[PDB]
């Protein structure tokens, strides 16, 4: 039964945090129960009923009009290298990462401001923020942040509670930080889109991180001590342009940790290559390595072992690089012309699975970004560096589990 | 026939109607110097458009800017490559043209090429040549014609660095006409920009000089002096900073940062277009073939056919001033090149190209408040309040004298000029 | 066939110029010059003549080689088709885009680097060739250890392991690092001159020899008249992945920074021929051969290939290295009109080899400062000295290898 695969892979993952915790016998249960409730409740919700996966559908369909609007302004700006006869020419060369993903990074960056300054995205995370906070206890602080997380990057998120970080505890801020690391960002997220990634899977995966970065927050590190209750751009012009300028160097950031990460990963393998030799292949990559070692984490979660390995490397390489080096390769087994047809249930494991910040990389960006917020935290935000990348590594695992469930029930993706 | 010579003046008598009703004080208006701007901008309009001893001047430092937008060219094709070659177009077809490529290292070049010219002192002289005309004739203060004079060449920002030990305690009225000459203005770099999209250079050289009588025009309409302008004698210019060591340190320095400005205009104009776009997505879905280019020329179309258009070419340079004010020049003239090719659905009159050429020349938008509010008030940080009140009369100022060009274009484009 | 005399000329010649311009010519420790001087002359002997020097060079050449195209699959990955073979069967020669051929290699290079000194590969390598200059030359250790890290990195990130030694450094020993960083290249900007054409193993050659031959020129032109400082030690990122993270942003906006002053650069040098070719065939390019063509000559350059390289020398000296360098590739095409000898492009290889330029100084300046800000004022006053110490170090690597070329 798919249900008991599933099931168990959920108790896995909730006994190995409980025994990572810090305070076992502190956590709250009332949180976490309600949590797991509620992001297998918005996966039941999307991927099961038929008018869930509607309303879905819906949402897919206005994002994509949305990025085919971004689309108008790299046409503009990029010309025809971003025409169709790309492809008449230089074949799947036609496709250049640096024009047609970076860019999007760009303009939802601008977006997302012009959404700030209207005053949509403070109803929006308000609303959920309040949600969560009335179900599972938490501190309101803790909980707009999550909801932020789900639109915006782990950095920019916590910046509509800024001035409570300074103060906040060591679980408020353990919570800011993994809410952060099991979510993407609404700019980043198309970008994975325009690599060919499933639409309504990011969607998905975006709002069940809100929850499932608290659950594991929470039972990390439970709340032990007491919080604290509580309760310019020039035009929108500004605002937008503002936006534009700073999506654009954090493009310019992401496509040069790309290009260098890329390239050293190809260095290494060059080095396992040879040393290799020696122990009887010469042909092992640190791709298979990863998939090797990470095989047994991609059965767990519903993935057939015949596709656990592959699983395997796209998990491995998300937390050791980023995500973007995940989908760059897990884009290259949902093309037709594939020589190995992944199934429908693992691709929507592996989806949800990698749709996350959570990597050794994003501990730095956020010891950078929340000092700048909170100064005096920067020790305690680096120390707790791990833990949050565990706590979002597993808050995408507990989605990929919820997700190979409900696809194995009713099964649905476009080719 | 001949009548064009009303149509005009009613344009003009329209204009400074609109400005004298938005003053603050109309009977602190110094009639000598808003009559001297009046016919000064007239006079440089005539000039380089009607005489034939003015049409070849304009026309010599046309080819000569030709010249340098060429010397930039081979910089492009040297970083570029085959990216900007003859076979772009054989390829790809009208695409082949691609902004990022085309455009925006005109910024770089320049900027680095300005950071010469002001290394060697040829551009503080010209200003202080012009600047002082400027003074002289109108009477405006001396910082005010410096900047004015200065903002031709250069952009708003940059162009009061000139006169920023005077800033700090400049009245409203010198702080408006600064604002206003930014405003009224293009940057030399920008300007290149436009040239490599299709838009008439010789135009944009008229419209650049004419920007500097044009904003001190609607700039002493709109806020008289009332108060005293400051003397060299009694002002203590704070000291140094940087000065560039030599002068490849100067040209390296100003290309780097025109690099920089060539990434936010460019990512700029990414967002813009894009959200344009997906406005006409809300409204076409709300409403079904409306669209925000359609209501901003529907809306302007009344002050497109003042000015000298024609009612039936009316609604398109309704479009063009209208996305101009609420975005930028960019967008505008994005949209414009497409009336100025041959095989064009839509062809527009030769006098109407060069109407909405001047009209459309100016960073008088709503953005550029915020830009100025920014760099001006790091000169002078106790100001900053002062100039974000008088931004939007700023930008006012800055149409209105954009316009004042473009009537006086229409006026003088009326007959065989055709440069 | 025995230009040894000739050769031998070229650096006597350039000592000479040294010492004329030296502070105190009574003040130079010969053992230190004439170490200096044998060191570097030893390393072209090894490298550039013996057989089993010429191996390790070529060996080296081969693995730096490998690391580039390793490189040269991020570049593929993020600008896609736009560097495929297919550029070449629509652009032609066109097809060979700068701004995406060579600048990625900057960004790859600086984070490589930047893992390099993160694992503690480049502290050792810092360790043990900077002590071994201190011991031959005399040379403080600090001073040694900054010419040592120059050979693998910039003139603004080299002097970072000496850092807080620069705010209490003597005139002398300032002048040493200026003079090594001047003298010297990165490894980033290396591997984007062997993407236009010009030769690996001459580049690796090259750079280091760089670090003795800026301490030679660097004591001849001011010795050390002070006391300076005994022992000094070498001496942060979260992890691997946030180093080279952090290397690539900064290898990016530097690519950026570079690109765009070649594009002001070679727009504003064809400015100027068109100023000069006004009514009221002459090129600055022609002018600066015809200026740098004795010094060309000294070195040991051929007078029928002498207006050649004064001119690629003389644009090195007053615009950059890349300008250089990108008029001297076409030299060293196959259809190219005007054929080199190959002891000539040798020497201009090695001359070329620098950041000793006129716009440089500002990077030193700006950098320099940032580590030690009260000696801001010794750094610009101490800048076009340097540059000549820089480019004497080069031309004395040109000699050399012009000598064992053949
Ligand atoms: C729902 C949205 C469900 C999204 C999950 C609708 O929320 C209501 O949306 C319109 C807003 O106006 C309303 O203010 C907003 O309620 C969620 O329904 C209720 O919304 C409340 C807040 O949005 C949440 O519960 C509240 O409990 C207390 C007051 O009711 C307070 O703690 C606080 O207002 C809030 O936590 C909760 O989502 C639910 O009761
Ligand atoms: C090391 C990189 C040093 C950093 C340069 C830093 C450059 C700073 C100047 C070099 O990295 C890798 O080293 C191994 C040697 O263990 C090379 O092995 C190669 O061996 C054969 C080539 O002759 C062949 O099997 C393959 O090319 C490869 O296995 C790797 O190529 C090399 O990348
Ligand atoms: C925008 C939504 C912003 C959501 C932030 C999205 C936040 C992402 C994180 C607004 O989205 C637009 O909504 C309208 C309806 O309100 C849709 O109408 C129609 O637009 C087009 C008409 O030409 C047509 O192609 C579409 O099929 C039709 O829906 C727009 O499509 C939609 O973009
Ligand atoms: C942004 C605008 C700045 C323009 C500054 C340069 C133009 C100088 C000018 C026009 C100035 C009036 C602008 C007015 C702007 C109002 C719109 C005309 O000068 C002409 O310059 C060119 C180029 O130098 C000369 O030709 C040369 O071009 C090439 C570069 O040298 C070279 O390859 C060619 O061999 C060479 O011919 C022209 O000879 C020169 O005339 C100065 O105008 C003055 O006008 C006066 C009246 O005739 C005279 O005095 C004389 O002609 C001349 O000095
Ligand atoms: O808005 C964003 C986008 C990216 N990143 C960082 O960049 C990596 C690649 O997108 C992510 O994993 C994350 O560490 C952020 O922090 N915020
Ligand atoms: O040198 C320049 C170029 C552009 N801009 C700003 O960028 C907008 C688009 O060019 C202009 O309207 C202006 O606000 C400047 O301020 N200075
Ligand atoms: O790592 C580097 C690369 C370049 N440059 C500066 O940039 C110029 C062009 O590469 C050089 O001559 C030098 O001045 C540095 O300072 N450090
Ligand atoms: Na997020
Ligand atoms: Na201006
Ligand atoms: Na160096």
Same mark, same amino acid.
């Given at each position: 039964?798919?249900?008991?695969?599933?099931?168990?892979?959920?108790?896995? +993952?909730? *006994?190995?945090?409980?025994?990572?915790?810090?305070?076992?016998?502190?956590?709250?249960?009332?949180?976490?129960?309600?949590?797991?409730?509620?992001?297998?409740?918005?996966? *039941?919700?999307? +991927? @099961?009923?038929?008018?869930?996966?509607?309303?879905?559908?819906?949402?897919?369909?206005?994002?994509?009009?949305?990025?085919? @609007?971004?689309?108008?302004?790299?046409?503009?700006?990029?010309?025809?290298?971003?025409?169709?006869?790309?492809?008449?020419?230089?074949?799947?060369?036609?496709?250049?990462?640096?024009?047609?993903?970076?860019?999007?990074?760009?303009?939802?960056?601008? $977006?997302?401001?012009?959404?700030? @300054?209207?005053?949509?995205?403070?109803?929006?995370?308000?609303?959920?923020?309040?949600?969560?906070?009335?179900?599972?206890?938490?501190?309101?602080?803790?909980?707009?942040?999550?909801?932020?997380?789900?639109?915006?990057?782990?950095?920019?998120?916590?910046?509509?509670?800024?001035?409570?970080?300074?103060?906040?505890?060591?679980?408020?801020?353990?919570?800011?930080?993994?809410?952060?690391?099991?979510?993407?960002?609404?700019?980043?997220?198309?970008?994975?889109?325009?690599?060919?990634?499933?639409?309504? @899977?990011?969607?998905? *995966?975006?709002?069940?991180?809100?929850?499932?970065?608290? $659950?594991?927050?929470?039972?990390?590190?439970?709340?032990?001590?007491?919080?604290?209750?509580?309760?310019?751009?020039?035009?929108?012009?500004?605002?937008?342009?503002?936006?534009?300028?700073?999506?654009?160097?954090?493009?310019?950031?992401?496509?040069?940790?790309?290009?260098?990460?890329?390239?050293?990963?190809?260095?290494?393998?060059?080095?396992?290559?040879?040393?290799?030799?020696?122990?009887?292949?010469?042909?092992?990559?640190?791709?298979?390595?990863?998939?090797?070692?990470?095989?047994?984490?991609?059965?767990?979660?519903?993935?057939?072992?015949?596709?656990?390995?592959?699983?395997?490397?796209?998990?491995?390489?998300?937390?050791?690089?980023?995500?973007?080096?995940?989908?760059?390769?897990?884009?290259?087994?949902?093309?037709?012309?594939?020589?190995?047809?992944?199934?429908?249930?693992?691709?929507?494991?592996?989806?949800?699975? +990698?749709?996350?910040?959570?990597?050794?990389?994003?501990?730095?960006?956020?010891?950078?970004? $929340?000092?700048?917020?909170?100064?005096?935290?920067?020790?305690?935000?680096?120390?707790?560096?791990?833990?949050?990348?565990?706590?979002?590594?597993?808050?995408? +695992?507990?989605?990929?589990?919820? *997700?190979?469930?409900?696809?194995?029930?009713?099964?649905?993706?476009? $080719?």
């Amino acid at each position: 039964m798919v249900v008991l695969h599933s099931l168990l892979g959920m108790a896995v +993952l909730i *006994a190995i945090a409980v025994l990572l915790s810090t305070d076992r016998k502190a956590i709250n249960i009332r949180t976490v129960a309600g949590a797991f409730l509620i992001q297998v409740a918005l996966g *039941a919700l999307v +991927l @099961y009923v038929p008018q869930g996966r509607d309303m879905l559908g819906e949402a897919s369909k206005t994002i994509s009009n949305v990025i085919a @609007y971004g689309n108008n302004g790299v046409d503009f700006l990029f010309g025809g290298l971003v025409s169709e006869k790309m492809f008449e020419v230089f074949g799947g060369g036609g496709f250049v990462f640096a024009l047609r993903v970076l860019p999007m990074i760009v303009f939802f960056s601008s $977006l997302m401001a012009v959404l700030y @300054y209207i005053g949509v995205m403070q109803l929006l995370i308000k609303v959920i923020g309040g949600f969560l906070q009335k179900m599972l206890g938490t501190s309101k602080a803790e909980s707009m942040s999550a909801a932020a997380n789900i639109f915006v990057g782990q950095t920019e998120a916590p910046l509509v509670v800024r001035p409570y970080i300074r103060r906040m505890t060591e679980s408020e801020l353990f919570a800011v930080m993994s809410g952060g690391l099991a979510s993407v960002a609404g700019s980043v997220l198309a970008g994975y889109v325009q690599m060919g990634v499933p639409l309504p @899977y990011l969607i998905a *995966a975006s709002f069940m991180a809100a929850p499932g970065g608290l $659950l594991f927050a929470k039972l990390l590190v439970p709340e032990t001590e007491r919080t604290q209750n509580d309760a310019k751009p020039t035009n929108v012009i500004d605002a937008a342009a503002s936006g534009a300028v700073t999506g654009a160097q954090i493009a310019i950031a992401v496509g040069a940790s790309l290009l260098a990460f890329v390239a050293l990963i190809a260095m290494i393998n060059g080095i396992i290559g040879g040393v290799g030799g020696w122990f009887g292949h010469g042909d092992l990559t640190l791709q298979a390595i990863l998939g090797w070692l990470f095989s047994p984490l991609a059965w767990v979660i519903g993935v057939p072992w015949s596709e656990a390995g592959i699983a395997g490397s796209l998990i491995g390489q998300k937390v050791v690089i980023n995500e973007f080096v995940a989908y760059s390769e897990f884009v290259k087994y949902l093309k037709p012309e594939a020589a190995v047809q992944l199934s429908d249930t693992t691709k929507a494991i592996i989806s949800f699975a +990698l749709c996350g910040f959570a990597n050794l990389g994003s501990i730095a960006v956020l010891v950078g970004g $929340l000092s700048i917020m909170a100064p005096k935290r920067r020790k305690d935000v680096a120390r707790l560096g791990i833990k949050a990348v565990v706590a979002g590594s597993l808050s995408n +695992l507990m989605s990929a589990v919820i *997700a190979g469930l409900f696809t194995g029930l009713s099964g649905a993706s476009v $080719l």
